[PDB]
């Protein structure tokens, strides 16, 4: 986020066009629920989802 | 489907050669012991969660 939460315009391209699936891993973080963590403790999965959403928002900004 | 028989576990029956193992066969009508519980052995779903296609289910004996 702090890499690209500004209109950096470079780290965003560096991240989206990554041959690592990481851009897909962020989406999975948002959507898919963490099965063991969420049952035992729900706050941390919520924090993960919020941070993933903030990162994805950072990934568009002035584009 | 091919055999038209239900997988039933005869609890009080030794296996072919196992010293202290139970026997499982195909009964054409069920001996009231043909109930198998799909517990979450995959460690991904939780009790009551939908059985995930491909999930490592645990078809434990009921009777």
Question: Summed up, what is this model?
Answer:
This is part of a larger assembly, with two copies of chain A (63 residues). With 63 residues, chain A is an all-alpha fold. Chain A has helices at 11-16, 22-31, 35-40, 43-58.
Rough outline of chain A: elongated
Cα-atom radius of gyration of chain A: 13 Å
Subunit organisation of the chains: part of a larger assembly
Order of helices and strands of chain A: HHHH
Helix share bin of chain A: 55-70%
End-to-end distance of chain A, in Å? Answer: 16 Å
Residue share in β-strands of chain A: under 5%
Largest interface: A-B, 3 and 5 residues
Overall description:
The structure is cut from a larger assembly and holds two copies of chain A (63 residues). Chain A is an all-alpha fold. Helix content of chain A is 60%, strand content 0%. Chain A contains four helices and no strands. Chain A has helices at residues 11-16, 22-31, 35-40, 43-58. In chain A, helix 2 crosses helix 4 (43-58). The longest helix of chain A is centred in the last third of the chain and has 16 residues, at 43-58. Chain A is elongated. The two termini of chain A are 16 Å apart. At the A-B interface, helix 3 of A face loops of B. Chain A: Belongs to the InsP3 receptor family. Chain A: It comes from Homo sapiens. Chain A: ATP binds at residue 52.
């Amino acid at each position: 986020t702090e890499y690209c939460q500004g209109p950096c315009h470079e780290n965003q391209t560096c991240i989206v066009t990554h041959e690592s699936n990481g851009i897909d891993i962020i989406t999975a973080l948002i959507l898919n629920d963490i099965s063991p963590l969420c049952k035992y403790r729900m706050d941390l999965v919520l924090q993960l989802k919020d941070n993933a959403s903030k990162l994805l928002l950072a990934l568009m900004e002035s584009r | 489907m091919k055999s038209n028989k239900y997988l039933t576990v005869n609890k009080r029956l030794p296996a072919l050669l196992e010293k202290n193992a139970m026997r499982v066969t195909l009964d054409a009508t069920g001996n009231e012991g043909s109930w198998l519980f799909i517990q979450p052995f995959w460690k991904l779903r939780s009790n009551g969660d939908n059985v995930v296609v491909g999930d490592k289910v645990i078809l434990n004996p009921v009777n």
